[PDB]
Structure formats: C-alpha cells, structure tokens
Design a protein around this ligand. Structure first.
Ligand SMILES: *[C@@H]1O[C@H](CO)[C@@H](O)[C@H](O)[C@H]1NC(C)=O
Ligand SMILES: *[C@@H]1O[C@H](CO)[C@@H](O)[C@H](O)[C@H]1NC(C)=O
Ligand SMILES: *[C@@H]1O[C@H](CO)[C@@H](O)[C@H](O)[C@H]1NC(C)=O
Lengths: 476, 49, 61, 146, 468, 91
C-alpha cells in the first residue's frame, strides 16, 4: 500500500513545516528594526554636548544625564520645526515624553550607633519597599512628589538591575523643544535626582508619519547605592494596524490556514491516544506530537490575546496632548518577542519532528564535498570562457557602443545578455562583421554547451546519491 | 477635478444625441471628520497614512 | 505511465521546493531562486528517474 | 450625495454653487463619481465609477472602473441562465447523496482521504455557481423595478 | 624528463600571455571613446537649424540636407568642441544618368525619364549645369585617389563630382550657397560624401570624419556616419619606451614560436593537424604575423600626419590611415581570444578538470552531428519568416536579420506586436510552432547528449581507477 | 499537456477577457501563454481586471507548467536517448 500510512503523514508534516516557515517569515519587521536602530544611534551614541564627553553608554556622574539632555539629545530629538519633532525632517516622534525617578525615601537606611557622630544615613537599591513616597526637596507640585504605582500606571518589572516599581516622582514634557529644554534645565538646577535616588527612566513614542510604524522608546538608568549609574535604552515596536492591503490579507489567510491545520492535526491525533495506548511519553514519537500541538495552540492563543484591543494607538492619535501609559504595551511587545523566539524554537522542534527518516544526516557529506569540487572545477572553465569573450567584446566594440566602453561594464553587459536583456542595435551597427559573429557564437556556447554541463553535473550527483542510498540502506 | 468635470464630463453626459445615458450621475462624498494635516511637498509620501 | 510518474515523484518535488523556499527565507533573514532552480534543472532528473523505473517495471509484463 | 441636476445649465449652476461654498476643500476623504452607461445596439449596460483618494491633503490618486454586463432578469421567464442554474443545482444533490451513501456504508473514519475531500469541493463549487447566478437574477429585478 | 617539458612550455606560455596582455592594453585610453562620443554629439545631435527639431540622423529630404550643410555642420566644423581643423573638408557626389532605364511601352507618354539604381555600369560621366569648374565635371577614381565604401544600399566607387571647400566660415558658406543656387542635387544624384579631419591639440588624438547620405531610387534619405580617432604617440613620456621594448619582445616570441612549430612539423611530417592543439597553434602564429605586418603599414605611413599642422590649403587623404586602424583591432582582438582559449592545454591535468575536458571531447561528434539537424530546421524557419515578413517588419528585412531575430527569440526577446499584424494568419502559426519545436523538443536533445556522455565518462573513469 | 493548456486558456479568456486586451480573443489568450513560457509578458495589469484570480492564475500557471509539466518533455527524451545508445552498444 504505502498510500495512506506512508504518503499522508509525511506530506502533512512537510505542509505543516512549510506553513510554520511562512508564518515565521511573515514576522520579521525590517522598517521597525531600522527605525529603532536609527533612534538608538541618535540617542545611545549621542554625547552630552559638542565639548563634553558624557554619552548615554558612558554614564559616570550625576551630571552626565543633565548635560546630555541639553545638547545632542536636543539636536537628534528636539529638532525645530519648519517646534515639531523631526531631526532629518523624516523621523516624526509621537506624542511627548515623560520622566520618572524612583528614589530612595528620606532615611532609607540607618547609620551605626558606634559611629553616629559622623555617619548620617545611607540609601538602599531600588525596590518596591525602597521607593520614595513623601516629598524630596522643594516640591511645588509633582516635580518632587512621588506618584503612587497604581495611580501612575506603573508596576514592577524586575529587569537587569532591580524591580523598579511604578512609585517615584513623575513629570511630563512639553510640546516645544525650547520648552522641553527649559524644563530640563529647571529640573537639573533643582534637586530632582539627588544623592538619595536609586533609578531613573524616560519614555517617549515615535511615529515617523511617513511610515506606518508607531513604536515606544524607553531609556533607563540604574543608580547603584555604591555611587554612579548605568544607563541603557530599549525600543518596543508594538503596532496593531496590520490590516492594510493585500499583504495583510495574505498574512491573515496564512494565519487562518495554520490555525485550521493545527485544529485538524489535534483532531486526528486526539483519538489514537485516548481509545488506544495511553501514557506514552518516552517514545520520542507520541509525546512530541502532543507537545507540538499544545505549544502551537498556546502560542496562537497568546498571539491572539496580545492584539485583543487596538484602541490604545487610536486614542493616542486622536488626543496627543500627554504621554500615554505605553509601558504596559511595551511589556506586551517584549512578551510577544519572547513568544516569537519560542516560536522559532518550536519551528526547530517541528523540523526535528520532520526527521522521522533518520540516519541520513552525516553519511552523505563525502558526496556533497565531491559535488562542490566538481562545481568549483566547472566555475574555472566558465569564467575563463566568459573573460575571453568579454576581452574580445571590449577590444572590438570598445570605442563605439557606450555599452562595451569600460571593462568593468562589459561583464555586466554580458550578464544582462545571459539573463535576456540583449540590445543588438549598436552591436550590428558598430560592426556588420564580428558583431553578429560574436553574438551568435556567444549564445551558442553559453546556452547550448556550457549551461547544459552545469545541469549534467548535478544530475550525476543526484543519481549517485540515489544509488548509494538505495544500495547501503536497502542492503543491510 | 472641477475643470475636469466642467470640460469633458458635461459634454459627454449631455449633448444632442451623444451616447445615451439611462440615469443621471451622482457625487456621494465621505468626510472622515478628522481633518488632515499635510506634509511638505516633493516626492509622494510613501503610499498613504 | 505519465500519471504514475507524476504522482509518485510528487513528494520529492514538494520537498525540493520547500527546501528552496526555506533557503530563500534564511537568505532574506540576514536583512531570485527561480532562476537558480530553473538553471539547476532538478525536476527533470527527479521525473526521469521515476519514469525509467516505471518503464522498466512495465516492460516485463 | 449630490444629484448634479438634469440639464447642462443647471448642472453648471449646482457645480459652481458647491464650488464656491467650500463643498470639497476639507478633510474630504473621497469623491466617488459614478454614473451609468447603456448600449442598445449590443444590448449591454455598463457601471462606470471614477474615484479620487486623498492620502494627505494637497494631492490625490485616481482610479476608474468600467464594468460591462448584461441586465438579464429573473422575472423574464425561463431564460438560459435559469435553466442551467436549476440543472446545476440537481447535480449538486445527486453528488451529495452519492457521498452520504458511502459515508454510511463505510461508516466512521472516512476522513483523511482524497476521495472524501475532493468530492466535497465539487459540491461546494456547484452549489455556489448555482446560487450566485440566482442572486444576480434577483438583484436585477430589484434594482430595475426600483 | 617529462615534467621538465611541461614546465618549460607553461613558463614560455605565461611569458607570452603577459607580454600580449600588457601590449594590447597600452593602446587603449579612456579618451579615445569619450572624444568619439563628444564628436558624435557635436554633429549628429544638434538640430539642423536653431528652429527645427530634425538632426542629421533623422533627415527626410534633400531640403533638410541643404539646411544641414548650411547649418549645424558649419557651426561644429568652425567652432566658437575645443578642436581645430587641419587641411580642408571636401564634398563629393555620385549620380546616375538619364536613359539608364527602360520605361514600358504602354505608358511611355506619361513618364519621360527614369533613373536606374546605382551601379558602375550605369553611372554618369557627362557635365551638367554650368560647366564652370571641378564641381560639374566627372573625374575618374584614379585622379581622385579614392576607393569603394560598401554603404547600406550598395557599394559606391571612388569617382564622382567633388568640390574642396575653404579654410574659414565665410567663403565656405558662400561656396555652398552658390552650389545650392544652382541645382547640384538633381533627381539623378545617388550618393553624397562629406570628408574632413580634426586634430584637437588639447589631448593628443586625431580624428577622421566621413558622413554619407544615400538617396535610394524610391525617394527618401538614408544617413550614415563614421568617426575614427587616430593617434601619433610614439616615444613621448617615460611610459612608452616600455611598449616599444614589449613590441620587440613579442616579435622575438613569435619568431621562437614559429621556429618551434616548424621543428615539430618537420619531425612529425603529417598527422600534426588532428590534435586540435596544433591547429590552434598555427592559427595564432598566422594571425600574429598578419597583425605584425599590418602594424608596420600604419607605422610607416604616418609621417604625413604632421605635414598638415602647417595650415595649408589641400585636402588630406587620411582614409587609408583610418581604415587600417580598424582592421588592426579586428585582428589584435581575435589573437587575444585564441590565446586565452589555449589555457585549457595546461589546466587539463587536474583530475576533475581532466574529467570535464574528456566529457566535452568525447561528445564533440554527436554535438556536431546534431548541430546540422538543428540548423537545417533553423534555416527552414528563417527563410519562411523572410518570405512572409520580409517587407513590413524591419526585423525580417534581410536573411541575416531573420537569423539574428530567431536567435533573439530563443533568448526571449520577441516583439510579437508586429508579427501578429503583419500577417494576421500564418504569423501566429509560425511563432507557436517555432516555440514548440525549439524550446520543448530540440533544446532538450543537447542536454540529453551531454548528460549521457558525462555519466558514461564518469563511470568509465571510476571503473578504471577501481581497477588500479 | 495541451488539454490543460486549453483549460488555462479558456479560464483566462472568460475571466480576464473583458478588461485586459491581452485575453480579448481566444487566440490572443493562447499566444499570451506561449509568451508567458518565454518569460516575455509582465503581469503589471493582470490583477487590475481581478484580484482574487489575478496573481493566483499567474502563480499556478507558472508553477504547474514551468516546473512540473514542461520538464516531462525533457526527461522522457533524455531517457529514450540513453536506451537507444544501449540498444546499439550491446549490438
Ligand atoms: C531623358 O532622356 C529622354 C530620352 O529621349 C528624353 O526624352 C528626356 O527629355 C530626358 N530628360 C531630361 C530631364 O533630360
Ligand atoms: C562661373 O565661374 C565664374 C568665375 O570662375 C563666375 O564669374 C560665374 O558667375 C560662374 N557661372 C555662374 C553661372 O555663376
Ligand atoms: C591624388 O594624388 C596626387 C598625387 O599627389 C595629387 O597630385 C592629386 O591632387 C590627388 N587628387 C586630388 C583630387 O587631390
């Protein structure tokens, strides 16, 4: 037979692998990644000023951030209008930024009693219980009064440094570059990030009105209790405007087909394990299918839930007079990126599950390394002939064609002729003999004798692979 | 648009006996309620946003 | 023989095209295969092998 | 909507009236000009639609569509598009019962084979081909009488 | 005793190859093409007047030609690009005679005269118009120091009615206007040549220019131009002497090669003409000797190239000096190709390369055998296309054009908008049957032969290796 | 081969044969597919007449008649040649 047990399961597995590959390929954001890289280059590599040498990646003092906010950060981001937000007139930032400072409360530690005559107090690391809540210095408004974590749309994250919650002083930027610079100068003059601070952060959004990509950019700085601070930045490309045109329709159709295939596979594999041999886990073939189905279902559900609501972007675009709570959206985007990495791992697992015909993994390298040798040997003859013809054309048609003018251009001309972009108007006109002869001989020796030798080599390689497999695998 | 309709559309729809019609035209419009802010001229801004 | 040689060789053709498309996806992941495969003339040899096998099988009866 | 009037002179009157009163200078996503066309020499109608879209204020992109069809109506008797639309609906039933008579006979677990899927596509195609022409015929009567 | 011969042959061939490559690239400068293109733009691209849109390469009547010779031609010849004229331009015409034609007796009363198509046996030799000077009297080819041209319609001789212009704009314009006042371009005129030369001292590069206008016997105008830049660089800077030494080295290498060839042919009195590595060795030496004798001519007759910066009043005859500069590239370019081919004689020792060459050699009789069956059909189709589409397509106007059009169709560069309307039937039939018989049937046969030969050669080589 | 060729030709004639002019008549539909085989025509306007069947037709045609059905004409010939050689060499 081998038509229902050896021609369907393998074909279905191959189709599932193809669908997974298509779904993975339809998840690479090129423009968003380029925009994030450009923003990081204009921000992370931005120094303090023209004469200062304090960059985002070189945080060494409490005045590095203050000097950075007025300078290159005001040139690559706070560019004047033609006060809009467009440095090269093409990077349109979305909304306005916001600043937060999770500082240690006044008296966040204790001094020794034996040395109480000289030691006053200390400050601990950033944490939920180590975040200031009362005023810190002159607090006219919210510039030095910490906002509640629940009341300021903040929560613990537990990043690379500590679990900085939403507690801490909060402030909002302005709608003008000059006003933002003035506010930054006012905050730097006063005690905003004092010695009793533990962490700082800033959150902005980028729209780039020419490109449909609204992302968030969050910079952070961990001020350790042992002096100094370490800054960093992170870009979250979270968007929910995917449904645009025929490409979006194709992506949605592929997603629906993948969901239907997963449902069909679950239906087909949920009957032969219930009314049949159960508890099969260490079989390398029964647990793998169940794990793959469960992982696919979980990933599909997580992806669907990540885009449950799309009203955040619409609300931000309708009213852009403040900084929206984009931290939750950035966290969701980070979780989506982690899910995408997990889906790449699941695609690798599916490829492994497509290896049910094993033992053909490393016993054939000796033949591939011989086919490579044959191809390398062929490439020498092909290139010798090609350069001989190119030199002939360059010497004969050198001064009268505008196509065989320079030697570096004759090669491209012959390549285009090979691909089928022949002109043949000047070639015959520039020389009625040795013009047609060159073209005719070139075509005959490049499409009938030398291009058919490339195929014969691979034909022989395939035939010998088939022969040696059908010999050794079917002999012992 | 206005010279376009005033130049070719009207002489085509109405005439002596020029290309029978079977029903007058219509000009239904959608407002979008969200008045747009333009971009400086030059190359067409990508496709649409 | 024409129908059989097409049906039996179908899985290998799909495997080859799947390999080519995933290779193209990997190539584009760093940041045309039609010409490459059309010049490799693979499908021809895949069909020829099966055609020879089926003709040999049918010759005896 | 704008009816544009009936006569050429009153058409110009309406055009200039809405021109000066700022009918189309605002946000104004689309314009959607579309009228009709008849041809009695060959007996065909044509739906004409001219559209401008404004991606950003200042410039527009144009697109036109001319769809020629034949207005054949369901209330015209027993014309060919109805005869070969009730006959096709019978071939979508004889091909369905012939599948139930195998579903029952083979019992459960007929799924996962080409013969039990490549024949259900035929039913789902014949039924659609039969049921789309009928809808078109009904729409013809409704629009023509309206 | 055997590796030594291979090594000496290889080193000799490498020295010869490097000498040849260095020698043929010292005669190619980036100015020889840019100057030609600029001169082509100066004359062939400017409008005939400052009001019309027709340039020289789009003439349509004798009046347009008269506009051109009293127009853009004078502006470019006597500039306000930075070149200077030497000698003096000359304008000549060739015409046929009335009565060289046979009107049918039926309608003799309606047509009083017809002029035949140009041919030496039917040329005019009598004065016309005012028999004043040299512009209205036939002069033989010998007295003119001329030669054939092989234009587009036919091959025109060197005789005709000629006139030498003046050194500056005013008298040249007056003289051409005096020619235009009378009828110097009658209905019998069949060809018109304009010849001159420029020096352009700014960058040392001569140029010889010849323009031709042909009036076919069916009315109309066909233009055709030819620019040829020459050079007189002998022993200038400190880079030359290098090329002068390289030429002597190349001549010595050719002498050594020919003496070795004669030694080998004396030892092997015959059967020396079958290895195909000996035919390619005598062709190279013959072509090099030809290219060595042709380089002497252009090097000997170049003393006059100077006797003309003296601002004299005579027409230089630089046609021969510009014709041999073209037939020298057509020889020095084939020798280079046939030398670069010869590398296969030495790289056929690697096992994979030897196997590839054996595969390509053992199937050189079936390939040539099938190349006749292919080209019989390829010409049967071409002659049919010539007969059917030979008058209204501009692509099948000649047999060679039909062949080249079919070759381009093989690559997939078909128009098909003219074929389908030139003959609404029997044209699509031709196209469809040609495509079917070529792409589906006759192209796979070559691949089958090559694949079978390669497979059997590889099997034979593997078996032979396994025996050892 | 030519039954499926005509099956594509008639489908293209019925679907696109009203708004392209490259499929206006049946003969033009056949010649357009023959020109598709050569890789001559560009599909810049096919999708304008229809988008559901616009690119789908082109992709399925190219795949099925330029990678699975156009080869069988080669393979067969090759195989035949081989046996013929044997059918002489043994003799
Ligand atoms: C041409 O020759 C014929 C022959 O007699 C004569 O009748 C006719 O007048 C001639 N035409 C001209 C223009 O000389
Ligand atoms: C012939 O030439 C003389 C001078 O050589 C000139 O005076 C005369 O005008 C010319 N003939 C005509 C008809 O112009
Ligand atoms: C042809 O050459 C001779 C030899 O110098 C010369 O006297 C004669 O003038 C030349 N012919 C012309 C038309 O200049």
């Amino acid at each position: 037979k081998y038509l229902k047990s050896v021609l369907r399961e393998l074909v279905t597995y191959l189709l599932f692998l193809i669908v997974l590959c298509i779904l993975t390929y339809g998840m690479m954001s090129s423009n968003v990644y380029y925009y994030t890289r450009m923003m990081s280059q204009l921000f992370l590599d931005t120094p303090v000023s023209k004469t200062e040498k304090t960059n985002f990646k070189t945080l060494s003092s409490m005045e590095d951030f203050w000097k950075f906010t007025e300078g290159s950060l005001l040139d690559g981001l706070y560019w004047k209008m033609q006060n809009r937000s467009f440095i090269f007139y093409e990077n349109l930032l979305l909304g306005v930024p916001r600043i937060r400072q999770l500082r240690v409360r006044n008296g966040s530690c204790s001094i020794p009693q034996d040395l109480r005559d000289e030691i006053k107090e200390c400050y601990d690391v950033y944490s939920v219980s180590s975040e200031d809540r009362a005023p810190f210095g002159p607090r006219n408004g919210t510039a030095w009064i910490y906002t509640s974590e629940k009341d300021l749309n903040g929560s613990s994250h537990w990043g690379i440094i500590a679990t900085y919650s939403g507690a801490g002083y909060y402030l909002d930027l302005s709608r003008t570059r000059e006003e933002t610079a003035a506010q930054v100068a006012s905050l730097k003059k006063n005690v905003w990030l004092d010695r009793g601070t533990r962490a700082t952060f800033i959150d902005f959004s980028v729209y780039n009105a020419n490109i449909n990509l609204f992302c968030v950019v969050r910079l952070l700085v961990e001020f350790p209790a042992t002096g100094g601070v370490i800054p960093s930045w992170q870009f979250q490309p979270l968007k929910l405007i995917r449904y645009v045109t025929t490409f979006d329709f194709f992506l949605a159709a592929c997603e629906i087909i993948f969901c239907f295939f997963i449902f069909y596979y679950v239906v087909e594999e949920i009957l032969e394990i219930r009314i049949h041999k159960l508890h099969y886990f260490r079989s390398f073939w029964n647990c793998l299918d169940v794990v793959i189905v469960v992982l696919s279902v979980v990933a599909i559900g997580i992806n669907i839930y990540r885009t449950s609501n799309v009203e955040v972007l619409l609300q931000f675009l309708e009213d852009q007079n403040t900084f929206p709570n984009f931290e939750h959206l950035a966290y969701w985007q980070i979780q989506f990126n982690n899910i995408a990495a997990v889906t790449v791992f699941f695609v690798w697992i599916k490829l492994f599950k497509f290896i049910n015909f094993n033992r053909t993994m490393s016993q054939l390298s000796t033949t591939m390394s011989r086919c490579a040798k044959d191809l390398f040997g062929f490439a020498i003859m092909f290139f010798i002939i090609f350069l001989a013809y190119a030199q002939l054309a360059y010497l004969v048609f050198g001064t009268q064609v505008d196509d065989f003018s320079t030697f570096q251009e004759c090669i491209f001309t012959q390549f285009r002729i090979i691909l089928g972009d022949i002109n043949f108007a000047e070639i015959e006109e520039a020389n009625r003999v040795l013009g047609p002869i060159y073209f005719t001989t070139f075509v005959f020796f490049m499409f009938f004798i030398l291009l058919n030798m490339f195929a014969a080599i691979i034909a022989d390689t395939y035939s010998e692979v088939k022969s040696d497999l059908a010999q050794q695998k079917a002999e012992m | 648009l206005w010279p376009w309709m005033a130049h070719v559309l009207l002489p085509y729809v109405h005439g002596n006996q020029s290309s029978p019609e079977l029903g007058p035209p219509r000009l239904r419009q959608v407002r979008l309620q969200e008045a747009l802010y333009p971009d400086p001229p030059g190359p067409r801004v990508h496709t649409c946003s | 023989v024409f129908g059989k040689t097409l049906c039996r060789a179908l899985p290998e053709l799909l495997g080859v095209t799947l390999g080519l498309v995933v290779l193209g996806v990997a190539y584009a992941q760093l940041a045309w295969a039609l010409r490459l495969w059309g010049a490799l003339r693979l499908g021809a040899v895949i069909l020829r092998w099966r055609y020879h096998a089926l003709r040999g099988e049918l010759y005896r009866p | 909507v704008q009816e544009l009037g009936l006569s050429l002179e009153e058409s110009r009157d309406r055009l200039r009236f809405l021109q000066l009163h700022n009918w189309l200078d605002n946000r104004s996503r689309a314009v959607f000009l579309e009228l009709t066309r008849y041809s009695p020499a060959v007996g065909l109608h044509a739906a004409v639609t001219l559209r401008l879209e404004f991606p950003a204020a200042g410039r527009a992109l144009a697109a036109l569509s001319v769809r020629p069809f034949a207005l054949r109506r369901l209330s015209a008797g027993l014309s060919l598009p109805l005869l070969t639309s009730v006959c096709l609906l019978l071939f979508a039933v004889h091909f369905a019962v012939a599948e139930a008579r195998t579903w029952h006979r083979e019992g459960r677990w007929r799924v996962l084979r080409l013969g039990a899927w490549a024949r259900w596509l035929l039913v789902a195609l014949t039924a659609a081909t039969a049921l789309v022409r009928l809808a078109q015929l009904g729409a013809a009567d409704r629009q023509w009488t309206r």
